[PDB]
Enzyme design. Structure first.
Site, PDB file in Angstrom:
ATOM      1  N   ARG B  96       0.823  -1.214   0.000  1.00  0.00           N
ATOM      2  CA  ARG B  96       0.000   0.000   0.000  1.00  0.00           C
ATOM      3  C   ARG B  96       0.854   1.261   0.000  1.00  0.00           C
ATOM      4  NH1 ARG B  96      -2.323  -3.907  -0.751  1.00  0.00           N
ATOM      5  NH2 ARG B  96      -4.563  -4.346  -0.567  1.00  0.00           N
ATOM      6  N   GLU B  99       1.946   1.706  -3.399  1.00  0.00           N
ATOM      7  CA  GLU B  99       0.834   2.213  -4.192  1.00  0.00           C
ATOM      8  C   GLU B  99       0.643   3.714  -3.996  1.00  0.00           C
ATOM      9  OE1 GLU B  99      -2.833  -0.015  -5.372  1.00  0.00           O
ATOM     10  OE2 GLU B  99      -3.777   1.393  -3.950  1.00  0.00           O
ATOM     11  N   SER B 122      14.693  15.151   1.849  1.00  0.00           N
ATOM     12  CA  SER B 122      15.706  14.158   2.193  1.00  0.00           C
ATOM     13  C   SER B 122      15.099  12.901   2.803  1.00  0.00           C
ATOM     14  CB  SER B 122      16.727  14.761   3.168  1.00  0.00           C
ATOM     15  OG  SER B 122      17.797  13.849   3.402  1.00  0.00           O
TER      16      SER B 122
END
Lengths: 156, 156, 156, 156, 156, 156, 156, 156, 156, 156
Positions: B96, B99, B122
């Site tokens: 996830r 995703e 960063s």
């Protein structure tokens, strides 16, 4: 909205056109999203091919960016999502978020299961936000908030 | 600390041994990190091979988990980082977060350049934390905060 | 200073047009960068789609290369960086720099951690230059200097 | 040396043993190389499986690290070189050097052909070094010097 | 020659046009290269995008093939080399040369290190030729000679 | 010989053992092959898992290298051929032969079809050898001869 | 025929045009090949970019399909062979033949070495055909016959 | 039989052991399959991990090969099929059958649809046979018969 | 129907045009399929390039979507099937079906072999249906039914 | 349960041991799941490393299969999910479900959006079952039911 796309290149080509119009008009994403009633991350994602705009918002950003009617309609289509060219970003700015997963991915899994249980943190019932803050030691920082519903994995 | 690893399998094998010991003692990551003065996300990441523990913390967590002296030393080495087996996670919980990069990766790039300029957020000058909050519509949510310094890309 | 690209093909197609104009005019990268106040590696990188030119420099190189206004604007946009077609170069000149990574990548990691500590050498706060020198045995050598800020990794 | 290896795992497994022994003995790469007459980057690379040590240096570092005779022999073998697990590094420290290639790879090609002509900068007739310098604005920088012979591609 | 290409598709598209003109004119590579002073393998490789022709040879073969002036200039540019579509050939004729590497690649390494020492046989200081000979058992054979400079790897 | 292998790791593990014995005994591939009646490239390829030795030759090299009975049998087995770890070599010495295919692969195809016709140059009815020659300009060169049968492609 | 192709896209684009014309004229591959004196599998493969037609056959099929003069010439060129888009077919009809290799590939190897010896069954000295037969249990079967010469691998 | 496997390495390791026993006993696959009532291609495939043997045949080949009880049981389990190490064979003998697909895959599709219609030729309701025959021109050929049921694709 | 495609891009480009016309006309897939006598999943798959429509259905949906004659013909051709851009979907909606295979793929294999025996569940003799049902806990669910014939793997 | 795994090989190695014991005991998955109160697909998935069993069911199946205590504990840990060895199955039985996605994946997306709207069908709030039925034309069919919650994608 029942209309959907199956080839990301249509909306990604439109995204390139939007970016050109936006640059020529000296517009920011915050300005484009203002007045839509929608979060800047959501509107920006729709412009870049990764969300669908409601009709009212599509007409509004279409007016701001001087888009034609096919484009305003395309922005309302449910997209074929996936913004990364070929799985792993090459762009340094995008890559840093992938590296975050390479370093902390198993830690996120471990801490999700510890605090919530078996299951997932949703990428669908999900909000994200980018906030610029001061770095107390000099400079600036981004505070990026990932806010997702816990969905349990339960036996059946 | 000037010692470093070049083969992630050494520390990841140690991680598996740590996880077995942790399961046998019914320990959480919050308890293992308690008393180190270090964030749970940082200590957990070290256990899982992705950070180096200072000597004081490596002996503290090493006593809790009944680790041999070679393992307490290994935990203090600078790792060969990268927790994903083969670039893209298969595990749903980990996937996830990948995703969210497929959906919002270009939005993150766009909003970073809008708010900060050319450059990156960063992954090194960087903190993250996981918080559980109640969902007003019922259930629970995870609020995951990524906090990174903006480093500019300037002409030279 | 806030406009950015998401599809590298736009700036890479412009790079091809720039290289054709450059060859027709018998220009070097050193001459194109002359008078910009910017290093030849930075200006060259921008022509090739990997940096953003400040407006004055974009207008100067655009005059030298007879670029249209859309192209001069494109050179000022923040790019979607990544110059390698498909992750590993095929071109021998480009490949030798990848081969240096295959031979010395873990040595660079080991010596960076020894001399500086945990963390990275930056590719963002970063300067590059290429110098041609005599080979004391006969012939010529390139001395390529990679000059990057050390960013430490510390517990939090 | 006429003996050579064909499977990198033999020398890379030896490298892991070397790194553990080095950690237990609290040794730096600089002091392992001290007394060999060889540069720290070359000796380090040999320890990590990417160069061959001459017999006198192999015996010297082998005594420092308490290596058995089979291992001292292995360090003298010409290696099957290639230190990256799977083509693209996952480790942030190593990855930044790959990112330099993604950003500047075509600029390096362009400037090499401009200054030298058609051909390559050798990765074989080649040396590198890592220096730490103070950053005038605060902190430290690494100056990494890549020094390779120009080899021309000429018609035949 | 100081001008170089970064996108192989420009010269490979030209190669396709060259091949169509060559077939229409019923020309061989031997006759195209005749009068250039250059080996057929070098001229052929240039037409196919993998070498740069000197100006005189470029004008000679461009006359033979009815190339326009942009194309004659393109043949003089230093190419972005790499003739294989996607790393491993699909074409049987080309694949056989890849198969010889899969069968004899480690033997070539072993025998190079035995006869010459540590280092490489150059693909840059390098000439190639293809000869047809009769097979004493009937039929014909190709004798393909790879002639490359030995470049040693020595300590530093 | 009617016995064949299906897992290359069996013969490649044997090759590693052969190489260690060979190094301990200070043997060359030329002297291992001496007395077999077979070319050094063929015998070397067999030791490295890429050819099958006839029984007399297997027993002769097994005596020289002090191999056990199972190992002498394995050398006679028809191998599962393929010496490259993962399709493209990482080792510089091996890589240069892959690079000659990236630069000259389409030239080899073109000249084969020009001199012989449609079809292939065999990698099966095939001999190779490596010869060291002096370079008149200083140093040494490898002349590597690939000698393969032409097999035509004709209609049916 | 001494002319050859290096980019499969030219002949594969032609194949698409051939298939459109074939569909509009309600033609079968059997009737396109009728009158050529060549097997339907050979002519079909040539139309699909994988074989070269003799001049007489190219003119004949080109008349049936209303092909222009450049197309008739292209059909006579020796192709850059390789019909699979990206190594493994997605199409179910083509995939089944790949699956037979995944299930029986090592059995084919084993039985070839048993019956013939070390070496290969040729894909060049090779023909195939497809036959429809009745299944005694109901329905139809395809009998696809692969007929290749055994080419031995012998010591040298 | 209702027991099945999920990790091919178990049966592939058994296959290597079977091959060693077979070599030591100087047995052929035809000899092993004799008396089973099953075709040599089916029995061979089972030995190599790609089919399941009925109990009587497993006991018979187990006697012939001196296999232990766990091995005889394993041969009866339904396998996790897939004999190719990593999608495309490296071995020349097996590669030729893959090349046959690269040259004729689309011709097989085209001719199957022309002779049978939309649908597939089965790899499941499927028999395979390898026959050695004389080459009328001299030498030997393999006639490999792929005999699969046509399964149509029809609207629903 | 005996005509078939080999390049999926032709039918996928048609799909994109169909989706635009569908969106402009405010049509659903259910509406388009109504009157064809064919299931919505089959007609939708045909529009999206993955099935062939009978002529009568092609004319009916073509009139509804205002398609030209070339498009109505194309919908009747047998496709080169495969709807996923690059093997693994990026789109979350389709990815979830891939994830069910990553989680339950071996369970499906195990239960198929337990209930049916060795062999497969057909993707060709196959029907698919999508139904919406209320969730008694609130919200909606999709019940997706995969209905395929069992084809046994039997000895021969 | 708060304990989770990061290396799938631990639970997949346990799965192999489970399958051996299961075969020796002539057990089916239906009867292993009997008495647990859990669906056969869920229990089977846990045995195969893709779900976590509650303590009661873990002890109950562990007795039936004669598992040691470390194994019964492992079955209760939250897994690192992902049963496919390398992204695309090789096994025909599991490949067919992947092929269903290659043919119908875009149809599933299109019909989900039409019936439900933007969002996904969950693979987490999800159950599946496999039923064996008669084929009314003869033979047997599998009806596989995928039952997943609709999760909407809404603007924010």
């Amino acid at each position: 909205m029942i209309q959907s796309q199956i080839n990301r290149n249509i909306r990604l080509d439109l995204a390139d056109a939007i970016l050109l119009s936006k640059a020529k008009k000296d517009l920011s994403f915050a300005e484009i999203a203002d007045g839509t009633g929608l979060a800047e991350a959501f509107v920006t994602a729709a412009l870049l091919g990764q969300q669908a705009l409601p009709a009212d918002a599509a007409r509004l950003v279409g007016a701001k960016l001087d888009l034609d009617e096919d484009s305003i309609l395309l922005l309302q289509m449910i997209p074929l999502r996936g913004c990364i060219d070929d799985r792993i970003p090459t762009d340094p700015t995008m890559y840093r978020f992938y590296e975050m997963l390479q370093v902390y991915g198993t830690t996120l899994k471990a801490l999700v299961h510890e605090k919530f249980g078996d299951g997932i943190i949703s990428a669908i019932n999900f909000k994200l936000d980018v906030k610029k803050v001061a770095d107390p030691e000099g400079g600036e920082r981004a505070v990026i908030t990932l806010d997702g519903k816990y969905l349990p994995t339960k036996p059946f």
